[PDB]
Amino acid sequence: TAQYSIIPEPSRTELRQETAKTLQLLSDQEVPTLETDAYRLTVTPQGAHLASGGREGRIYGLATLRQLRDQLAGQPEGIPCGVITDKPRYPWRGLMVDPARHFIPAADLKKFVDMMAYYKFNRLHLHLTDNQGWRLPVPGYPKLKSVASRREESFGDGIPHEGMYTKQELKELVAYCAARGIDVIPEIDMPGHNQALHAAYPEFFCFPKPDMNVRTTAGNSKELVCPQKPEVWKFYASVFNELKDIFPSGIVHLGGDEAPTELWEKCPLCREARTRAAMKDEQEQMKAFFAKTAALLAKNGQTPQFWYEGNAGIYHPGETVYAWRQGQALQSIEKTKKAGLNLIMASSEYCYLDFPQIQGQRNWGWMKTTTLQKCYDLDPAFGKPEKEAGHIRGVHAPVWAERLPDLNHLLYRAYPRACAIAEAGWSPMGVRSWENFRRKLADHRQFILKRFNYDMERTQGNEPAFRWE
Numbered sequence: 001t002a003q004y005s006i007i008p009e010p011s012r013t014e015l016r017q018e019t020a021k022t023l024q025l026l027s028d029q030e031v032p033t034l035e036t037d038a039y040r041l042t043v044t045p046q047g048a049h050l051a052s053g054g055r056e057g058r059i060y061g062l063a064t065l066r067q068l069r070d071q072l073a074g075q076p077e078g079i080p081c082g083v084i085t086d087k088p089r090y091p092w093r094g095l096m097v098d099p100a101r102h103f104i105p106a107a108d109l110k111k112f113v114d115m116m117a118y119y120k121f122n123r124l125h126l127h128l129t130d131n132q133g134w135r136l137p138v139p140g141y142p143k144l145k146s147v148a149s150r151r152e153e154s155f156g157d158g159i160p161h162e163g164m165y166t167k168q169e170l171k172e173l174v175a176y177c178a179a180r181g182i183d184v185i186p187e188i189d190m191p192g193h194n195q196a197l198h199a200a201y202p203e204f205f206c207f208p209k210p211d212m213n214v215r216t217t218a219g220n221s222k223e224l225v226c227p228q229k230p231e232v233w234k235f236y237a238s239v240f241n242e243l244k245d246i247f248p249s250g251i252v253h254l255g256g257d258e259a260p261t262e263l264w265e266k267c268p269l270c271r272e273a274r275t276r277a278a279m280k281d282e283q284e285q286m287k288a289f290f291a292k293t294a295a296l297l298a299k300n301g302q303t304p305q306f307w308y309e310g311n312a313g314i315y316h317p318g319e320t321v322y323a324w325r326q327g328q329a330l331q332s333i334e335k336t337k338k339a340g341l342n343l344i345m346a347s348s349e350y351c352y353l354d355f356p357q358i359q360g361q362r363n364w365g366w367m368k369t370t371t372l373q374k375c376y377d378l379d380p381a382f383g384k385p386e387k388e389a390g391h392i393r394g395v396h397a398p399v400w401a402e403r404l405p406d407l408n409h410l411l412y413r414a415y416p417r418a419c420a421i422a423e424a425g426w427s428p429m430g431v432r433s434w435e436n437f438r439r440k441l442a443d444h445r446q447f448i449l450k451r452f453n454y455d456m457e458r459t460q461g462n463e464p465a466f467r468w469e
């Protein structure tokens with residue numbers, strides 16, 4: 001029967017037995033009887049009444065009101081009256097874009113931000129640096145622009161790809177997201193994922209190779225910055241100061257996935273440094289490296305985030321890690337609870353949106369299929385109650401862009417599974433069901449077509465064409 005098609009599903013909906021043909025905002029109050037992230041929207045035959053506990057809840061309420069107006073535009077007979085009392089299950093609901101692999105122009109970022117805000121996402125994670133490119137401008141290091149932001153091709157396509165954001169563009173993005181209720185989280189991978197950095201500044205590395213080029217294929221790089229060189233730390237101080245000036249969130253994602261340490265083992269500087277500090281192997285050196293980086297961030301008033309590694313030992317209680325490996329989600333939950341860490345659920349089994357969403361679509365020889373229903377199966381706590389898994393801050397979906405060269409491909413792979421991620425991050429389990437979500441997404445096809453002029457229809461053969469083989 002008559003109901004709302006709001007994604008994510010509100011925490012409480014009470015429908016009433018008459019129809020409203022107008023959603024004109026008649027009242028808009030800030031009330032202390034709601035949490036700062038909660039709202040109450042009342043639909044009456046005369047219009048809508050919005051109450052919110054704060055600016056964040058008001059932004060969420062306006063998103064819900066937009067979805068209601070999009071529904072009303074398609075139902076000339078009107079939508080049901082009622083009362084929506086809403087607040088999120090988790091305070092962290094994030095998407096990650098990967099401009100390092102493929103640069104994303106500022107206007108495409110604005111469109112992406114608008115779409116994710118329509119679904120009450122509040123975290124935007126920028127994977128700014130990797131082997132295939134460096135997108136963060138740092139004063140005093142212009143080769144990052146002239147070398148590390150340009151690559152000759154991508155997987156042998158013979159087409160150069162390049163791009164780097166300006167400080168002004170990044171501050172514009174920050175203000176844009178803030179106006180839409182989204183905090184921006186930069187990621188600067190270290191000490192690895194630095195082939196582009198090595199192409200730009202080989203003297204930062206244990207074995208400088210002047211012929212090093214920015215990587216044009218996937219895979220791992222053995223090139224780690226040398227922790228013994230003072231210019232490395234001067235450079236990272238400069239990077240962190242730029243991040244402090246640009247991104248007010250004060251959160252810096254350092255990557256932190258297990259790096260191959262063969263070159264550290266061979267490095268004469270690092271060899272004598274390990275001997276001098278009585279370090280047994282290169283994992284103690286990695287611990288010392290991350291301790292130094294964390295001290296630097298803390299002196300700047302910044303806080304680190306990591307891709308979780310169970311037996312890394314580089315973490316301090318209170319810090320935040322991401323669960324990402326296939327089938328390690330519950331183990332990561334329990335390990336972080338033991339170690340006093342906070343956890344963000346980004347498990348590749350449910351949250352990696354670079355994987356094909358329909359079986360048979362391009363998998364590039366390794367990607368498994370993550371359907372929309374599979375995605376919606378995601379419970380970030382994995383059956384545990386909030387009183388038992390209170391250290392879980394929320395959900396995070398990465399859209400890795402090795403094979404996503406423009407916004408069209410990016411949005412094709414990101415949606416509509418990002419809607420499922422949003423509902424998993426926002427809606428309590430009591431109001432979640434695959435049937436309701438499927439109905440609502442069927443309506444949201446037209447909602448998105450009307451509001452963003454974007455086509456969310458997904459068939460096996462309607463994915464935009466690629467240039468690779």
Ligand SMILES: CC(=O)N[C@@H]1[C@@H](O)[C@H](O)[C@@H](CO)O[C@H]1O
Nearest residue numbers: 255257307324352354400401402
């Ligand atoms: C920390 C880490 O290893 N992240 C990788 C990322 O570099 C890669 O682009 C993606 C491909 O799906 O897989 C992730 O696991």
Ligand SMILES: [Zn+2]
Nearest residue numbers: 206226267270
């Ligand atoms: Zn070294």
